[PDB]
From a paper:
The initial step involved in oxidative hydroxylation of monoaromatic and polyaromatic compounds by the microorganism Sphingobium yanoikuyae strain B1 (B1), previously known as Sphingomonas yanoikuyae strain B1 and Beijerinckia sp. strain B1, is performed by a set of multiple terminal Rieske non-heme iron oxygenases. These enzymes share a single electron donor system consisting of a reductase and a ferredoxin (BPDO-FB1). One of the terminal Rieske oxygenases, biphenyl 2,3-dioxygenase (BPDO-OB1), is responsible for B1's ability to dihydroxylate large aromatic compounds, such as chrysene and benzo[a]pyrene. Rieske oxygenase systems have multiple components whose function is to transfer electrons from NAD(P)H to active molecular oxygen and ultimately oxidize aromatic hydrocarbon substrates.
Previous structural investigations of ROs have demonstrated that substrate bound in the active site is oriented such that the carbon(s) oxidized in the dihydroxylation reaction is (are) closest to the mononuclear iron. This trend is also seen in the structure of BPDO-OB1 bound to biphenyl. The 2 and 3 carbons of biphenyl are positioned closest to the iron, with a water/hydroxide molecule bound to the iron positioned between the substrate and the iron. Crystals were grown and biphenyl was added in the presence of atmospheric oxygen. The enzyme was oxidized and no electron source was added; therefore, catalysis did not occur. We are unable to determine whether the iron is coordinated to a water molecule (hydroxide ion) or an oxygen molecule at this resolution. No significant changes in the active site main chain were observed near the mononuclear iron compared to the native structure. The loop covering the active site entrance of BPDO-OB1 shifts upon binding of biphenyl. The loop main-chain was pushed slightly away (~0.2–0.3 Å) from the substrate in the complex structure, while the main-chain proximal to the mononuclear iron remained static. Comparing the ligand bound structures, biphenyl carbons 2 and 3 are closer to the mononuclear iron in BPDO-ORHA1, 4.3 and 4.6 Å respectively, as compared to BPDO-OB1 which has an average distance of approximately 5.0 Å for both the 2 and 3 carbons in the three subunits.
Residue numbers in the entry:
A (entry chain A), D (entry chain E): 6 to 454
B (entry chain B), E (entry chain F), F (entry chain D): 5 to 174
C (entry chain C): 6 to 451
Write the structure that this text describes.
């Protein structure tokens, strides 16, 4: 047993084993929708960015017709990489080896000496670069390798309820700012994934240094004091397709010292958000998030950092750090949020620098044979979770909880066990049977007030 | 554009040598105080790989950067090493700088434009080792019997940083 | 086959193959007693040291009661390493991720927000750190993962006869002196293992510069000359459980230039050793040893270097170099032995620096496919050996021999073939059948 | 399929996959004759070099009787490497561990303390360093491991017709000039192999800056412009055992800026070469070659660079660059050719430095799973090829083609599929059936003039 | 073998520092005319691993060498990088030099024999990094005001070059 | 202690530059005579990874140490390289030092407290390469020729040595 959804525990082979990584690449990264980027990274027709779909290099390009297309960054001639630039504007991509010109959708448009050497016998339509399915959600561009997969709408599914709160907001929505901060971290891709999905428990201990100096609202978390009630101060969420996040109330501009533009933006837009998405989602709109979109995209709403974990084997990843910001926010406010986000969660971040060893140590400790045969515990908040009357999916009582952990590894187990999407789609009705307490929030809300 | 005299070059070399000792010994408060001015702009911009035919301008302070701090925000970074209970850094990582190719130029108004190469070697725990190479660009002015940097631009060589973090001063 | 005990030869796959290394980890380092340290490394109650048990990290801790417990250095929550310090004093070990504190025996004593977040719905008895069995022999602490294994004293077995000569001696015994010199050598763990078990043949050739420079009684070995009688100069030994060592007669303080404390200690304590263990073991007490304890510990009594080869895969190891010194010796003598041991066999040792390529080249030459299909030869002095009347186990004629080589790979082959200890325990009365000449020492002495 | 000979395409798994490399090492490097060196590298009795045969370290030695013997550079005692010197003169090789003396033929001749410690019981006859089967052709020394393999002349076969043009020529022949230039390149060994066998197509595109600067005859290739007639400018050949090369007419001393002695040597020797072999091979004698001998030797006759690609796994090689010069040429001309060859195709070569990425990027692009499951095209000039009534094997109309590419991977597929040399030799009469245009050159020659 | 004076040592140090800046900034044409003589011999011989008992003489210019160029052949190499359009170098590799142990000695005819240690750090694309340790032996003359090298022997440490190429000036 | 004058700092730099050349060329006997005092204490302590709350004293020359030699024991180490037939040194392995951050201070009685960073790059055989970074604390002493070190404390960065050995001076 790699993952135990009933007991809420996982084997240490998940971070270390190379054959498990082979199953992950086949039944997750070559199946589910992966984050390519945003339309702000490729705004004008012709603009493109090279990015990773796990270990596959891909060129996301903004098309001349208006659509967004992506394809594998590899020439059909000898396999050579077509484009090496991180970003730019190009109507056609030329390979550096022989000069095969590729189109904006990866179609082989032209080849040098076609009439002379090839004698026009080269079937260029069959020699197109392996195209990738591209779909957008509120500007955020995703990518998928499986034709039999569902839509990006359905893949997010009930998680769209939450995303709409911030990714639409008061009509403006949000966008990514580049260029990103690329850096290699010697750890498994799931350790930062599980961390950013619902690890409010480490915030007080690991980031006790930074939180104490900054002060404000989040200073009380430092040292893991038992006096402060975390159940009333926050909540946690998890969905059908492994998407989940923790939320801290009234801490949107938490870590920001220079937050005038960002704080005023929320106070001006909270009235519109209360009207659109109700007071239940306005509560989230004013709070600090710690989200991971399955499998390998994470972000912190409020702190406004946006990360994507590109796996490079079972023991290493390449962390791409963007800065997520509102569209309708001022250019000065966007620059302010960028500086504060990078100062906190950049390559030399005041917080991010603390997690460095926490990610690597968990992975490379499994180098020992007796160690990796052991197991991991994710049972924080077992019994105190279930379907909320208002909020969709499963909800936890506190942000310092492991409801998101369980939901992440449950969908992981489902994807790893299932041979195809047809087997996954069959369990749409009975996916949350592993969460036994059904009448939890009914009894809890009746006891309150 | 005029290169500084050999005697002035020694004092700038000696300033950076003292500055390196304070980084390695962990005397950041004492560095921030003497060898850093209150109008400092500590800047480490993010250079992305572009084609040579690309006509876009180089990254400005308004654009994304790893470091982009003033004295107050730079002071906040320093206090994490002192007042903070950072578990990664008990004990502190051993760092060692190798400054070379120091070339000062008279920038007028008693200000000096200095260019230099920096090779940072970092060691922590048992077998972990990471190496970084940077191209520093400074503006130093004479303040009392010494120097103080007020503009500082650090150009990283590697696009993808092969390290847990870049939390170290140069 | 991998090992041939009959003809005394081994395949080159033993130093290279991945699947063999996977079988080694499981059928050796996860079954045998591995050297953790000594009481001197953790003298007072509360003192601890982090160390390796192969590729597993473990925390050896002196309990408040006095006993010693060890457990895997990994938090039961997410698997993160609990303690990164080499040594120190601690009544509890806190994990750096979320703050899970563990006791001296590796039990989950307390966790932050257990009342609030967990609601006391956490079986902390079952979520303790993976404990390891810990037994000690004359101060020297060992560790074992397999619960079905025998005792440490029985695992040593007939080898105890020899160990008692030096690890007890006059009465005090010996103790390690840290901190150790850690260093990575790109080679298989067996190559140093076989070297220190009985490779006196390489000493005259490889360390011809060091021996000729230092001079003395060990200077004659340099160059490998046939005129000197090696049969009279020393002997070689090997036991049932893979342990073995060579000995040079009256060469204890051979490599030491400054040796007023170490030599005079032996001169004062030899009379006590002669009374207790007799003249047969007095011979060993004055001689320079050359030992390896199976699997992966080794030392040199005389030069007083103590090494443990922690494997990091089939083509890499981490060498921890402690300094083994006598307890009853004076503080000045202990420090003198430490400097001489490190100067000879340290990281920048005058001898150890010569062996660098000899370890690595033997392993990495098997990168080629045609090379690794070849075989190695350990047949120096086959037949010229057998059961000694006085000394237990099997003994060889000269220290320059491969009796310990044969005995090392023989038990190695047995451990690799046996699925459990019951299969190994079955062949206690038929382990030395590979050595044919039983009436060798009976005729030689007559 | 790993290689498709009908459609002329190969899978990208060949550059990347470890199991394919395991087969390559079993079925190609352990079978085919590998280039060890030349007589000139070890000219006199006692002379040796250390070189590789794949990942195996070997010691080639010039014997007392004049013959050449090779053996594995590894001691029979504990495996330790015997000789670390790149070259020298020695009547015996002593292992540095214990001192086991090995002869020139790799026989364990002497052991320290044999009578004393070993008691003369050590069977030294059976403990010889494993000998490699050595055979030579026109000075060039080869090495083989398989006992059932054919002779060196049979292995070359049809290709010797071409080799005799240059490796004998006027009578002098050719020789290698050491010491070589050793350097690691992060790529598969087949990418340089296919490049030097017949990639005239990349020469104009990749080396446009270098060729345009030098000028002369080869300056016209810069940019691969359609105006020029590539068919008349050269040809391309391939043979049974995968040996093949392209030719550029009257461009031998093309890249040589200082070509005084080299061109004068050709002008003096072209007459006797014409009378010996004929005007069809005189055309070749004056032309610029780009050859690869299967599996892993390659050279450029004219520019006079000689390379051997020693594989260090599927994703790395060690390039050994020699300089190939004629025996009868003057010492000053040899040194002039040496400098011009290294300046062009050395470690810091003006041309070879351009190809650095083209080799590595083609290999490491297959790090992604979706990428490496794709395919590579090699259909340039398919159909425009066949058996020549004068030249042996299969010939192509232009040197900018992929006849050699097809023929290289065709024999590669034959070796990887066949379980032994007996199964290979069965295809002697039906190897070139994959080239369907039988009546190509008969129609071409009769239609012309 | 007379060591140069401290005043002359700085001028040679400042010359190599200005020389390093030109390689890093990619100003090869100005280097080729301003800091190199027209009778230059740029040489980098191929040393091989021999036994100590071997008595064969060390590599000469007649033997094999990675570099063995005159002035025109150096100009052939420089103009490739400058006017040409190399795809491998679009964009362009980040390079950085770290000169050390600059010991100069006086020779005949106002010439200076200079020994120097060089560490070259090269970065390119996303995660590609290579290091080269090298020993430099030069003969410099005083082109007032001003130095110009006319002999340059580069000694590589590693036998097998762990890099795609060695196409960079020292 | 007060920092040394520019003229004195140059002589110490020139002394170390010469000292490095003697290590690289393999002139260990001439080094020991000229450049080393007869009461030398060559010391390289084995530093341990300890928690910040742990208040044990720093290692001392009678705790474990890699180097802990006097002049007579330094001769033993030098004579191994000369008269000895070490096989790992056929051929002799290449080493290259990069001394930086040299800062001298007047201790007293004609003695100089000198701190400096050292980066050792070692190469041997075909593809074997190892790097070492370490801090050096010296007490130099003036005499007829120039200087002679009588105390030398070398501080290794890495806990676990990623090399076959540390058999090299400084
Ligand atoms: C995961 C990642 C970051 C945080 C977080 C850090 C600081 C302030 C607020 C939340 C919580 C969970
Ligand atoms: C194996 C290892 C070391 C020695 C040895 C070396 C020097 C002095 C005494 C024994 C003998 C065999
Ligand atoms: C393959 C390799 C090299 C060349 C070539 C390069 C320059 C000049 C002449 C031929 C052609 C094909
Ligand atoms: S590899 Fe892209 S054109 Fe040949
Ligand atoms: S991992 Fe050790 S506390 Fe959670
Ligand atoms: S290993 Fe070569 S002689 Fe023992
Ligand atoms: Fe965090
Ligand atoms: Fe030894
Ligand atoms: Fe080319
Ligand atoms: Zn200053
Ligand atoms: Zn500024
Ligand atoms: Zn970096
Ligand atoms: Zn100048
Ligand atoms: Zn010259
Ligand atoms: Zn190099
Ligand atoms: Zn001096
Ligand atoms: Zn001292
Ligand atoms: Zn080190």
């Amino acid at each position: 047993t790699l993952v135990d959804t009933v007991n809420a525990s996982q084997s240490r082979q998940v971070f270390w084993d190379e054959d498990v990584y082979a199953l992950e690449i086949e039944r997750i990264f070559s199946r589910a929708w992966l984050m390519l980027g945003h339309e702000s990274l490729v705004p004008k027709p012709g603009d493109f960015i090279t990015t990773y779909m796990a270990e596959d290099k891909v060129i996301l390009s903004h098309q001349s017709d208006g659509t967004f297309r992506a394809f594998i960054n590899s020439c059909s001639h000898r396999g050579n990489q077509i484009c090496h630039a991180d970003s730019g504007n190009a109507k056609a991509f030329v390979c550096n080896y022989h000069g095969w010109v590729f189109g904006q959708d990866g179609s082989l448009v032209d080849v040098p000496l076609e009439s002379r050497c090839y004698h026009n016998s080269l079937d260029k339509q069959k020699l197109a670069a392996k195209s990738v399915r591209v779909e957008t959600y509120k500007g955020f561009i995703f990518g998928c390798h499986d034709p039999e997969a569902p839509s990006l709408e359905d893949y997010l599914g009930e998680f769209r309820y939450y995303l709409d709160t911030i990714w639409e907001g008061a009509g403006g929505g949000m966008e990514l700012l580049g260029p990103p901060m690329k850096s290699l971290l010697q750890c498994n891709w799931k350790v930062p994934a599980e961390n950013f999905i619902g690890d409010g428990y480490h915030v007080g201990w690991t980031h006790a240094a930074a939180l104490s100096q900054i002060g404000g609202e989040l200073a009380g978390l430092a040292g893991n004091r038992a006096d402060i009630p975390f159940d009333d101060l926050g909540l946690q969420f998890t969905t059908r397709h492994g998407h989940g996040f923790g939320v801290i109330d009234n801490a949107a501009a938490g870590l920001h010292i220079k937050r005038e533009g960002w704080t005023k933006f929320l106070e001006d837009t909270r009235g519109e958000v209360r009207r659109k998405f109700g007071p239940e989602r306005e509560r989230l709109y004013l709070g600090h998030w710690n989200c991971s979109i399955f499998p390998n995209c994470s972000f912190l709403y409020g702190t406004n950092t946006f990360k994507i974990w590109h796996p490079r084997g079972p023991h290493e990843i390449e962390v791409w750090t963007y800065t997520i910001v509102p569209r309708d926010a001022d250019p000065a406010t966007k620059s302010m949020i960028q500086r504060e986000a990078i100062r906190t969660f950049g390559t030399a971040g005041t917080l991010e620098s603390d997690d460095g060893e926490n990610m690597s140590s968990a992975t490379y400790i499994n180098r020992g044979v007796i160690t990796r045969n052991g197991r991991m515990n994710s049972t924080m908040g077992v019994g105190y979770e279930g379907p909320h009357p208002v909020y969709p999916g499963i909800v936890g009582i506190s942000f310092i909880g492991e409801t998101s952990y369980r939901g992440f590894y449950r969908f992981w187990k489902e994807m790893i066990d299932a041979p195809d999407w047809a087997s996954v789609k069959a369990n749409d009705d009975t996916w949350d049977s592993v969460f036994p307490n059904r009448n939890f929030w009914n009894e809890k809300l009746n006891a309150a007030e | 554009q005029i290169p500084v005299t050999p005697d002035v070059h020694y004092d700038i070399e000696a300033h950076y040598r003292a500055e390196v000792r304070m980084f390695q010994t962990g005397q950041y408060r004492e560095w921030l105080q003497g060898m850093v001015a209150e109008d400092i702009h500590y800047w480490m911009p993010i250079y992305e790989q572009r084609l040579t035919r690309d006509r876009r301008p180089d990254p400005t302070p308004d654009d994304a950067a790893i470091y982009n701090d003033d004295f107050g925000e730079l002071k906040q970074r320093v206090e994490r090493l002192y007042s903070g209970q950072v578990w990664m850094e008990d004990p502190p990582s051993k760092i060692r700088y190798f400054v070379s190719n120091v070339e000062a130029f008279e920038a007028g108004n008693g200000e000096l434009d200095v260019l230099s190469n920096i090779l940072v070697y970092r060691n922590r725990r048992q077998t972990e080792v990471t190496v970084h190479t940077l191209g520093r660009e400074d503006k130093l002015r004479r303040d009392g019997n010494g120097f103080k940097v007020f503009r500082r631009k650090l150009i990283l060589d590697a696009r993808v940083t092969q390290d847990k973090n870049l939390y170290f001063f140069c």
